[PDB]
């Protein structure tokens, strides 16, 4: 059996390594979260551009980053790091996705992989909701309530049918979960909890549901 | 055997998930606690209304939420969330009860299920006590001591007999436990510990009693 | 094997239950400690009164609580709770003692039961010391040093012989342990560490001595 | 099975020993880190001097410490400790390296040894980068951006070919990892994170990669 | 298998017992540390006095405590506790040593016993160093640097030979370890780390060396 000294020292060293790595990466962390939230959001667009431009990933990355810049303009400072991370993740998105899924698989066998895929799915859903909210605001031109109203309109009576295979994000995710995640993320984290909240709530809900369903449900008697 | 790295990372990730989920849901937590305390309290009333109105759960939910509003009036701000959660829990009370009991069963085999049922029973008892206190205060019209006096009067000499099958809440719960829970909850949490205190004390007492009774009692010799 | 999720959730829920229960009972905790310290101290007196008054526990409890009041007078506010707890523990002392010993037995097989009995024995010893100190102060009438001097006089040269079977408290307890416990309790907790200090030190010493004696003593060679 | 008391006391005593030892060594810790960062950096230079001066380690240590002084001058206070530690580590570098690698081997079987060797390799890489940055700054004579530009120039288009077997440091280490480590270390620790950041990130990355690769990668299907 | 409840409650109760005992003994702790550091330091002197005065431990304790007083004078307040503890430990030194070694043996089989013996050996070494420092200061009569210079002079060129079997303390202990322990203890704890530092560092070094040597040293290849 392993002695107490080795277990304690391993725990202590792993804790130091994790804390030090987060401390080192902290100046980049928020930028990375944004650049990568966007990347998950717009990955199908990147694939379409890939198909369009002769199957050159470099061209697709260049055009997509230029498009992102043209979305910002029309504050590059403190966002050039975000653009750089977005370009890197567009260039090596498949590798980073494989790494994340493989780490999750190591943590939890198949539940972790499904959790990662669900988190990507939720990010895509929330991003489409935000894009639709911005479009509707522009149309009404001639933000708190607009996102919520758009979310209700998108999935409330329009479950999956109209605009086929395009609102299939919400078909796999709970309405209440996404709504509460968005609101709690905005209140708690702020403009980034808009994506963190739904992701955390959806992933936690799926993990806990899968974990709890292992035992049979209690009998009424 | 599982290595230290996996155990530590699983513990750390679960802790982060739990803390982040509580942080996200925190703006709603108190409202949810109230809306759901009420729902456990008035569930038999909801079932009676269900029976009355042609067995339509939607009609019962609408009427019961309208009744709750007519109890508030005669401050909707910062309480519309409470009303919304109450309506949702009235609509899907059985599903949420099944989920809570099934999670408790996963945590503790049968002790958790009994703990959840006891917590519901204690909430119902305290709610009936509070309703009787308010009624007696209205009659004396022509709050600290009134609740305590009503609690003593309800179960002190009236154990279970008069008003049959109606004060059967206290038949399964300790007097001292409920009284101390009410007082400590009011002092500690405030107007919500009125229900948290009795629930926490009753659940903890049942769990610890069941746990301790596993070994035989110590012999006097 | 139990998974990490269940172990972590059980630990977290038990910690929440314990912390919440202490938070709820906190307004009563000190009063309960006093009312129950006294009860352990005066239990033989209660048994003698029980024998005197026709074997009626209610009469013994009434007379003993009245005697406690006549000791306070000759500040009832913030002490009526103490008197109430004292009366309850006088009424159901055997049940509470059985519960404490049975919980200790569940924690530690036989070491816990012996620890509880030792804690009661130490409380009785310190209480007799305090009573003798007060009596000697009254005689000298015609507090820090008086208790210490009385403790030295009681057991220093008078080990167990004079006043037979009456100073048998100190025959089972270390002098240094009681003295240091009294002093450290007064300095740390204040007028209640007068009983907590000796109890904690005696219980910890017995537990650690029993634990350490399991292995053979190290050889000099 | 080991009882809870022994495990808890062992953990507590080891924690006290570690915390007390760090508390005692704290006045020296930073100096030691520097004197030893330098020693890892300039070890090949020390070996060349060893070969030059008749294979006398004492002569090599003396000359190398004198050279370090001549680098400082052209603030000895609060640095004489650094010079002393540098001289000691130059005198007994192999023994300290063996001790560090052997402790790492005890913690992690072969992963720890590889981690230590990687940390030394990363320190050597960053030190060569810093030396080249200082040289280029002197040439441009006739610091934040200069180090980064030098790092890009050293390995960006010059992977390993020009100046053969001399930029073989970067051949085993990620560009992004070193760059992010340098930046995060400067921002977090300051002029010492210049070496801590790359070391922590490289070691953590290798450990986590080796740990995660144990399970097969998740299948796309 | 033991359930989670018992493990958690045992850990929690042991933590409470340890914390409460340290809290109670805290007013005495520093005095005890000093009175007992001295006792380990002067134990051979006590044995010589024992041999001189007809083998009467009481006489030896009386004379040795009187000698300690004559060292203080030529501030008894806040030191009478120190003198009392010194007298007690002189009276029952063997019993306390047996208890400490037996507790250490229970914690760690043979490594703990060796650690305790090493701690005593280090205390004796540092005490002899301090005595020699004071003597040399008195001779130079006609403190920071004097202790360090005396330490270098005692063992630097005089390893064990001159004054035979009298500087055999340093023959078993590292120079660097003692020096760093003294300096770090003075800086961290203050005039008591003069003994704590060397003890903590020596004990930790021996424990970690013994622990690490269990696995074979890593091969160079």
């Amino acid at each position: 059996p392993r002695d107490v000294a080795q277990i304690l020292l391993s725990v202590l060293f792993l804790a130091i390594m994790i804390v030090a790595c987060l401390w080192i990466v902290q100046p980049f962390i928020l930028g990375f979260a944004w650049a990568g939230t966007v990347v998950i959001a717009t990955w199908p667009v990147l694939l379409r551009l890939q198909k369009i431009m002769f199957g050159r990933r470099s061209l697709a990355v260049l055009v997509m980053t230029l498009l992102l810049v043209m979305v910002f303009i029309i504050f590059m400072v403190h966002c050039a790091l975000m653009l750089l991370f977005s370009a890197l993740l567009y260039w090596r998105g498949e590798q980073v996705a494989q790494g994340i899924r493989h780490f999750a698989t190591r943590l939890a066998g198949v539940r972790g992989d499904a959790a990662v895929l669900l988190a990507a799915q939720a990010i895509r859903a929330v991003a489409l909701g935000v894009v639709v909210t911005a479009l509707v605001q522009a149309v009404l031109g001639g933000t708190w309530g607009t996102v919520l109203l758009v979310w209700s309109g998108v999935v409330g009576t329009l479950d999956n049918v109209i605009r086929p295979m395009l609102i299939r994000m919400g078909a796999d995710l709970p309405l209440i979960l996404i709504l509460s995640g968005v609101i709690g993320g905005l209140i708690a984290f702020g403009m980034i909890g808009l994506f963190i909240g739904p992701v955390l709530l959806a992933v936690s809900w799926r993990l806990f549901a899968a974990w709890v369903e292992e035992v049979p449900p209690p009998t009424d008697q």
Side-chain angles (χ1 to χ4, degrees), chain A:
Chain A
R2 274 171 301 186
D3 63 358
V4 184
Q6 171 156 358
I7 308 297
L8 173 62
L9 279 189
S10 310
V11 159
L12 188 152
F13 266 74
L14 258 65
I16 287 174
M17 293 177 71
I18 284 162
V19 164
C21 288
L22 272 69
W23 194 351
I24 286 154
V25 183
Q26 171 203 92
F28 320 103
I29 280 178
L30 184 62
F32 183 67
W34 270 117
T37 288
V38 177
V39 182
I40 298 159
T42 76
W43 194 254
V45 182
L46 178 77
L47 268 295
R48 297 284 175 81
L49 278 165
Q50 182 72 259
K51 293 182 183 293
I52 288 302
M53 293 182 286
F54 316 95
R56 297 288 295 164
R57 176 52 75 92
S58 66
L59 274 298
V61 167
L62 167 70
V63 165
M64 187 66 204
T65 300
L66 188 139
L67 195 64
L68 209 69
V69 171
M70 295 296 172
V71 174
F72 270 15
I73 297 89
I74 291 175
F75 45 102
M76 183 278 288
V77 192
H78 85 271
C79 288
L81 186 149
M82 182 183 318
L83 274 296
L84 165 74
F85 279 160
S86 277
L88 287 187
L89 290 194
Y90 275 128
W91 176 45
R92 288 270 203 257
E94 301 90 335
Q95 271 63 62
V96 183
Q98 288 305 115
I100 297 278
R101 296 210 297 137
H102 182 50
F103 166 78
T105 291
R106 175 60 188 269
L107 265 182
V110 183
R111 292 185 283 120
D113 188 13
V116 164
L117 290 188
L118 182 73
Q121 182 67 221
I123 276 169
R124 207 161 297 115
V126 175
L128 184 134
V130 161
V131 160
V132 169
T133 300
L135 182 137
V136 170
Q137 188 274 331
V139 173
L140 284 189
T143 180
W144 195 301
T146 61
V147 174
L148 281 291
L149 191 138
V150 159
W151 265 121
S152 281
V154 161
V155 76
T157 178
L158 172 52
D159 209 0
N160 206 33
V161 286
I162 310 305
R163 308 285 183 179
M165 61 79 71
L166 204 59
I167 303 92
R168 82 291 188 278
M169 283 73 74
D172 291 331
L173 280 76
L175 198 155
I176 295 300
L177 214 59
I178 299 299
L179 273 291
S180 175
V182 164
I183 296 292
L186 265 70
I187 294 171
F189 312 116
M191 197 37 64
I192 182 56
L194 174 63
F195 293 94
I196 282 180
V199 166
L200 268 294
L201 287 190
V203 167
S204 301
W205 166 247
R206 272 300 190 280
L207 259 58
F208 274 71
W211 176 71
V212 169
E213 294 293 328
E214 289 170 359
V215 295
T219 187
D220 60 334
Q221 290 299 88

